[PDB]
């Protein structure tokens, strides 16, 4: 029926309400998903050393502790000694790679999982990971396209010696002599593949992981991330009805209905993001605060044609409340200074605050006759300059220009200099002294006589008429 209010009401009404048990189900799914990515982050060597390089910048006064960690499971001293533990577990696991290492690589993860990272930092890690995987995909697809598409080799036979290695020369130089139909064709592109293999094998140096593992790890991460959003989305969809129930209170506050319910939906999104079901707090009354918070916080900001800071808004509301009771309490209405004593502040601010708080009047407001004459049609232009004046400006130029030719060439130059007449800016009488080489008092005398010469009327009768 269009009217987008309806096509929403009907689109969400399909989603079935969550049972109190179903809520924990979804919340449980979230925990698994995130813990997967947490564990997946713990399994990246570069992810540890980077955190190390960051704390070494913290102890070197190149950063602050607030810009890196939000705290662990569970103060500068505690932070310092906790980071030492991480560094400790890294330096053992590092040298044990000579098979058995795995048991210690498993413990290095555990300690790292205690760190609750700042969201910005966490995002950068994952970004670094996905960017590293782009770097791997670049080389994977290059070596594939340089063989299959260019040199005409089937992909069926291209993957046999790839899996498990994709670094060393077992596949590239030992498979071209096999005399298969696709074998002898691989020589033309050899120069381009083997030189691009550099970054491919370098990744296992930087990241300290064979190209094998590099895909797996962030694949589980991808899976986990998907699961998280899946569940969280699911949760939000279940509680849309709650948002609707809250926004129906705030309707006429000056924002549209669908505007309200959308802003509230974001609040609900935040509520899911920060919710922990292990606390036993019913999800309804926990999200209500977040949803209600978003609505008001939005209404305060954008609902006005002139944005006002929050504290200003709250001030205004307090006045309405008093004016309500005091309307009938006083039998007339509180005097402009009445609410002033009731309110904390200097109390003369009532006038100022009350003025800027007012909403602008529609310039299209019809006034009179019902005719197309509208308020905006009556607002005159004050920034323009009337022609009856502009004519006198062009004249005054011709005036002073005439009267400055009646003087000596230096009096005109000195007077045109001391004022902005036909020149950029103007020059201080000391500056003028530098241009003429005879300086200080000398110039000032000349100025006096110049103004004096225009004072006694022959010159004077024309310029005096400009001041009325």
Partner 1 sequence: LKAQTKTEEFDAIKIALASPDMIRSWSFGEVKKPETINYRTFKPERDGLFCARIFGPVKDYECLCGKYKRLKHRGVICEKCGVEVTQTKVRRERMGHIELASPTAHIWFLKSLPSRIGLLLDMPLRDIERVLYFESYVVIEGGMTNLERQQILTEEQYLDALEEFGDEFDAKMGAEAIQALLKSMDLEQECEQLREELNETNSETKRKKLTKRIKLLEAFVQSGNKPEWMILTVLPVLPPDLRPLVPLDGGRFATSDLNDLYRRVINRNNRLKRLLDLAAPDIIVRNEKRMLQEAVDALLDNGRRGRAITGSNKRPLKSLADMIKGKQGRFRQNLLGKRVDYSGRSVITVGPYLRLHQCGLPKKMALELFKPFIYGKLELRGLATTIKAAKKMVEREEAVVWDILDEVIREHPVLLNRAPTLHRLGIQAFEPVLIEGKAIQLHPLVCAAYNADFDGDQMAVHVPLTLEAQLEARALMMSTNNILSPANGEPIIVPSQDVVLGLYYMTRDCVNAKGEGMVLTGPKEAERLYRSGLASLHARVKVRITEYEKDANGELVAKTSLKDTTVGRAILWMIVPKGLPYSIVNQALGKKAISKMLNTCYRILGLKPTVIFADQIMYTGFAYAARSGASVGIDDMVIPEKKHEIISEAEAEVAEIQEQFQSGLVTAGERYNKVIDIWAAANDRVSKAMMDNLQTETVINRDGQEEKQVSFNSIYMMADSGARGSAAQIRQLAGMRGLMAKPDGSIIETPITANFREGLNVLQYFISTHGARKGLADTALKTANSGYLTRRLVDVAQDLVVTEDDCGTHEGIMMTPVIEGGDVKEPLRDRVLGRVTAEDVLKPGTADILVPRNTLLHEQWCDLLEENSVDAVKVRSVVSCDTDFGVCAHCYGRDLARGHIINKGEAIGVIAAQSIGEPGTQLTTGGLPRVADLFEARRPKEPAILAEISGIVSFGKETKGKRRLVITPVDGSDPYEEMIPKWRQLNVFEGERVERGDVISDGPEAPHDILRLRGVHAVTRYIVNEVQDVYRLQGVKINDKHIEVIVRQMLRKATIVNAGSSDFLEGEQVEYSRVKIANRELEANGKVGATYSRDLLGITKASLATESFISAASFQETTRVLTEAAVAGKRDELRGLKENVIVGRLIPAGTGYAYHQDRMRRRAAG
Partner 2 sequence: TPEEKLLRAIFGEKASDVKDSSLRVPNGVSGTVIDVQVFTRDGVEKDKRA
Which residues contribute to the site for partner 1 (CB under 8 A)?
2-4, 7-8, 11-12, 15, 229, 233, 236-237, 240, 254, 256, 258-259, 262-263, 265-266, 269, 302, 305-309, 355-356, 358-366, 372, 375-376, 379, 383, 388, 391-392, 395-396, 399, 424-425, 461-462, 465-466, 468
Q: Is residue 165 packed enough to be buried (19+ CB in 10 Å), middle (13-18) or exposed (0-12)?
A: middle
Integer CA distances (angstroms), 445 to 268, 345, 457, in order: 79, 58, 20
Q: Is residue 422 a contact residue for partner 2 (CB under 8 A)?
A: yes
What does 422 interact with, of partner 2, partner 1, none (CB < 5 to 8 A by kind)?
A: partner 2
Size of the residue set binding partner 2 (CB under 8 A): 21
Rounded to a whole number of angstroms, the minimum distance from the CB of residue 466 to partner 2 is 6
What does 451 interact with, of partner 1, partner 2, none (CB < 5 to 8 A by kind)?
A: partner 2
Rounded to a whole number of angstroms, the minimum distance from the CB of residue 241 to partner 1 is 12
∠ CA 245-248-253 to the nearest 5 degrees? Answer: 145
Rounded to a whole number of angstroms, the minimum distance from the CB of residue 455 to partner 1 is 16
**Cα atoms in the 13 Å half-sphere on the side-chain side of 376:** 7
What does 373 interact with, of partner 1, partner 2, none (CB < 5 to 8 A by kind)?
A: none
Residue from 400, 407, 411, 427 binding partner 2 (CB under 8 A): 400
DSSP 145-192: HIIIIIS---HHHHSTTTTTTSSSTTTTTTSGGG--TTTGGGGTTHHH
Per-position b or e across 49-58, b if 16+ CB within 10 A of its CB: eebeebbeeb
Write phi, then psi, for 129 (nearest 5 degrees). -60, -55
Cβ-based neighbour number of residue 301 at 10 Å: 14
Type and span of the H or E element at 21: helix 20-42
Rounded to a whole number of angstroms, the minimum distance from the CB of residue 349 to partner 2 is 14
- Which range touches partner 2 (CB under 8 A), out of 24-32, 53-61, 139-147, 412-420? 412-420
Site for partner 2 in 433-462 (CB under 8 A): 451, 454-455
Residue from 12, 421, 429, 462 binding partner 2 (CB under 8 A): 421
Rounded to a whole number of angstroms, the minimum distance from the CB of residue 340 to partner 2 is 11
**Would you say 53 and 215 are in contact if contact means Cβ atoms under 8 Å apart?**
no
In three-state secondary structure terms, 139 is: helix
In the structure encoding, which two tokens stand for residue 27, read together?
């919340």
Rounded to a whole number of angstroms, the minimum distance from the CB of residue 254 to partner 1 is 6
Residue from 168, 335, 435, 458 binding partner 2 (CB under 8 A): 335
Binding residues for partner 2, rule: CB under 8 A, are 335-337, 396-397, 399-400, 415, 419-423, 426, 451, 454-455, 463-464, 466-467
């Amino acid at each position: 029926t269009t009217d987008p209010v309806r096509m929403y009401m009907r689109e969400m009404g399909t989603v079935e309400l969550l049972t109190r048990e179903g809520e924990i189900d979804i919340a449980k799914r979230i925990e698994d998903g995130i813990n997967q990515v947490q564990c997946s982050v713990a399994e990246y060597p570069e992810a540890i050393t980077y955190l190390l390089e960051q704390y070494d910048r913290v102890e070197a006064e190149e950063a602050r502790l607030s810009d890196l960690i939000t705290g662990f499971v569970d103060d500068p001293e505690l932070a310092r000694e906790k980071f030492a533990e991480l560094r400790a577990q890294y330096v053992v696991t590092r040298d044990t790679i000579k098979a058995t290492a795995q048991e210690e690589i498993l413990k290095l993860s555990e300690v790292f999982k205690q760190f609750r990272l700042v969201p910005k930092q966490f995002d950068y890690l994952v970004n670094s990971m996905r960017v590293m995987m782009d770097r791997v995909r670049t080389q994977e697809r290059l070596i594939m396209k340089l063989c299959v598409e260019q040199c005409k080799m089937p992909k069926k036979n291209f993957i046999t010696l790839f899996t498990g290695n994709e670094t060393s020369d077992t596949w590239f130089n030992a498979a071209i002599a096999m005399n298969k139909p696709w074998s002898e064709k691989l020589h033309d592109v050899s120069e381009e593949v083997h030189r691009a293999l550099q970054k491919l094998q370098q990744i296992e140096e930087e990241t300290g992981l064979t190209i094998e593992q590099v895909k797996d790890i962030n694949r589980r991460m991808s899976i986990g991330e998907a699961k998280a959003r899946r569940a969280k989305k699911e949760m939000v969809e279940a509680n849309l009805r709650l948002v609707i129930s809250i926004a129906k209170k705030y309707t006429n506050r000056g924002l549209q209905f669908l505007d309200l319910i959308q802003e509230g939906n974001i609040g609900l999104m935040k509520a899911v993001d920060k919710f922990e079901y292990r606390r036993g707090y019913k999800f309804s009354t926990y999200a209500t605060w977040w949803i209600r918070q978003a609505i008001t916080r939005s209404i305060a900001d954008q609902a006005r044609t002139i944005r006002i800071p929050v504290h200003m808004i709250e001030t205004i509301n307090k006045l309405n409340r008093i004016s309500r009771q005091m309307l009938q309490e006083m039998g007339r209405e509180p005097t402009p200074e009445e609410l002033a004593e009731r309110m904390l502040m200097p109390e003369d601010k009532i006038r100022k605050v009350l003025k800027i708080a007012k909403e602008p009047i529609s310039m299209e407001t019809p006034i009179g006759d019902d005719e197309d004459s509208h308020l905006g049609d009556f607002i005159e232009d004050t920034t323009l300059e009337l022609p009856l004046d502009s004519a006198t400006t062009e004249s005054l130029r011709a005036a002073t220009h005439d009267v400055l030719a009646g003087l000596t060439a230096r009096e005109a130059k000195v007077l045109r200099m001391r004022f902005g007449i036909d020149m950029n800016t103007d020059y201080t009488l000391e500056e003028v002294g530098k241009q003429f080489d005879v300086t200080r008092e000398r110039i000032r005398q000349i100025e006096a006589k110049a103004l004096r010469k225009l004072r006694h009327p022959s010159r004077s009768e024309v310029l005096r008429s400009f001041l009325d």
